[PDB]
Enzyme design. Structure first.
Site, PDB file in Angstrom:
ATOM      1  N   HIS A  80      -1.391   2.086 -14.399  1.00  0.00           N
ATOM      2  CA  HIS A  80      -0.666   2.435 -13.309  1.00  0.00           C
ATOM      3  C   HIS A  80      -0.228   1.665 -12.212  1.00  0.00           C
ATOM      4  O   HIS A  80      -0.622   1.704 -11.090  1.00  0.00           O
ATOM      5  CB  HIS A  80      -1.097   3.832 -12.687  1.00  0.00           C
ATOM      6  CG  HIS A  80      -1.050   4.912 -13.818  1.00  0.00           C
ATOM      7  ND1 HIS A  80      -2.219   5.459 -14.755  1.00  0.00           N
ATOM      8  CD2 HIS A  80       0.152   5.788 -14.236  1.00  0.00           C
ATOM      9  CE1 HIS A  80      -1.705   6.311 -15.463  1.00  0.00           C
ATOM     10  NE2 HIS A  80      -0.285   6.561 -15.156  1.00  0.00           N
ATOM     11  N   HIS A  84       4.065  -1.462 -14.593  1.00  0.00           N
ATOM     12  CA  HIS A  84       4.452  -0.047 -14.915  1.00  0.00           C
ATOM     13  C   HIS A  84       5.772   0.380 -14.085  1.00  0.00           C
ATOM     14  O   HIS A  84       6.723   0.659 -14.759  1.00  0.00           O
ATOM     15  CB  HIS A  84       3.303   0.937 -14.915  1.00  0.00           C
ATOM     16  CG  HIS A  84       3.679   2.374 -15.190  1.00  0.00           C
ATOM     17  ND1 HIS A  84       4.217   2.813 -16.412  1.00  0.00           N
ATOM     18  CD2 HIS A  84       3.769   3.240 -14.449  1.00  0.00           C
ATOM     19  CE1 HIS A  84       4.523   3.936 -16.360  1.00  0.00           C
ATOM     20  NE2 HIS A  84       4.180   4.371 -15.057  1.00  0.00           N
ATOM     21  N   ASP A 119       4.564   5.713  -9.106  1.00  0.00           N
ATOM     22  CA  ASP A 119       3.262   5.804  -9.269  1.00  0.00           C
ATOM     23  C   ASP A 119       2.449   5.059  -7.994  1.00  0.00           C
ATOM     24  O   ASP A 119       1.380   4.703  -8.193  1.00  0.00           O
ATOM     25  CB  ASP A 119       2.717   5.043 -10.727  1.00  0.00           C
ATOM     26  CG  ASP A 119       2.592   6.267 -11.569  1.00  0.00           C
ATOM     27  OD1 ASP A 119       2.282   7.407 -11.527  1.00  0.00           O
ATOM     28  OD2 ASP A 119       2.797   5.748 -12.879  1.00  0.00           O
TER      29      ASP A 119
HETATM   30 NI    NI Z   1       4.133   6.476 -14.348  1.00  0.00          NI
HETATM   31 NI    NI Z   2       2.431   9.199 -12.668  1.00  0.00          NI
END
Ligand code: NI
Ligand code: NI
Ligand SMILES: Nc1nc(=S)[nH]c2[nH]ncc12
EC number: 3.1.4.17
Length: 330
Positions: A80, A84, A119
């Site tokens: 994450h 990503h 994220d």
């Molecule tokens: Ni994600």
């Molecule tokens: Ni997430």
């Protein structure tokens, strides 16, 4: 502690960056893998924003500051992370280019930004973990714990001096885009995906789906967020397989922490249960990925290549299960 800020060198360097011409053609395709071009990732995002939204959509200096500060607020976790973020934003770009006039200028700019941010400041721990062990974040955000945090991080970065890419929007459009971004980030909570997909499937199948209805639009945008978040499953097999190694690195590190707190982790998070991984992947594809891309393709037919690639990868996991796997590098 606090929000990290890029350096003068970082954002001015991005401003001067030029994307190699051969990549222009490749970036338009769904299956494009950013993997081999790490130095270019921030520049790739600038390119996508400028193609989708226009070179004058954002003040360039603010945009470059914003991008480089976003990067600095992703942690050095196995999955994450910044890579990503840019992968998810690229999938969204490809969806938007193929469905361009279904979405307003404000939606396109908001969604590309939401994807890049979705994220932010992830720690490599799941909602399950934070709530099991009553992390302060779980007290503050009773549901969709990390996603509420990611949205809060987004607003913090926008609030940094010289970072507010949305300031030039009218007061009305500014509130609207922040709401686009909040909804889109919250939608990346897979807990909410199951309900959303079932609802959309019904609206689609009965013919009540109507994109002039704001709540329908919200739900469609929701599913686009899931499809972009999970898009590692739509790449070529070796790329999908490598990304899975990173995801599981996170999972196993969380499971290790639960063992220390006296709880046996779910098998998926247990590094001593790697034999169950292929069946677990089958479960994930049948329960989550395949239905997502199936419904997305019904609603947005140009997205069909995501579904075809997802199906191909499902077939590969099936081969793994049957013992037919060939040589892999990691
Ligand atoms: Ni994600
Ligand atoms: Ni997430
Ligand atoms: N098996 C899984 N693959 C991906 S890309 N994401 C996931 N979340 N939870 C399980 C999985």
């Amino acid at each position: 502690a606090g929000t990290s800020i890029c350096t003068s060198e970082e954002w001015q360097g991005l401003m001067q960056f030029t994307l190699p011409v051969r990549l222009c053609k490749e970036i338009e395709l769904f299956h494009f893998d950013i993997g081999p071009f790490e130095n270019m990732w921030p520049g790739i995002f600038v390119y996508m924003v400028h193609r989708s939204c226009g070179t004058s959509c954002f003040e360039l200096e603010k945009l470059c500051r914003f991008i480089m500060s976003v990067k600095k607020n992703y942690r050095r976790v196995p999955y994450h992370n910044w890579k990503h973020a840019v992968t998810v934003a690229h999938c969204m770009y490809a969806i938007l280019q193929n469905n361009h006039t279904l979405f307003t200028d404000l939606e396109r700019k908001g969604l590309l930004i939401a994807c890049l941010c979705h994220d932010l400041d992830h720690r490599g721990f799941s909602n399950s973990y934070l709530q099991k062990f009553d992390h302060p974040l779980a007290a503050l955000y009773s549901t969709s714990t990390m996603e509420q945090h990611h949205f809060s991080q987004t607003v913090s970065i926008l609030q940094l001096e010289g970072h507010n890419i949305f300031s030039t929007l009218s007061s009305s459009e500014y509130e609207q885009v922040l709401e686009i971004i909040r909804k889109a980030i919250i939608a990346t909570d897979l807990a909410l995906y199951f309900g959303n997909r079932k609802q959309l499937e019904e609206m689609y199948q009965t013919g009540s789906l109507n994109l002039n209805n704001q709540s329908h639009r919200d739900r469609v945008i929701g599913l686009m967020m899931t499809a972009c978040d999970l898009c590692s499953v739509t790449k070529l097999w070796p790329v999908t397989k490598l990304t899975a190694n990173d995801i599981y690195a996170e999972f196993w590190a969380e499971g290790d922490e639960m063992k220390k707190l006296g709880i046996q982790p779910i098998p998926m998070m247990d590094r001593d249960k790697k034999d169950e991984v292929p069946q677990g992947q089958l479960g994930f594809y049948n329960a989550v990925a395949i239905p997502c891309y199936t419904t997305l393709t019904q609603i947005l037919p140009p997205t069909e290549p995501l579904l075809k690639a997802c199906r191909d990868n499902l077939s590969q996991w099936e081969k793994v299960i049957r013992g037919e796997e060939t040589a892999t590098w990691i």
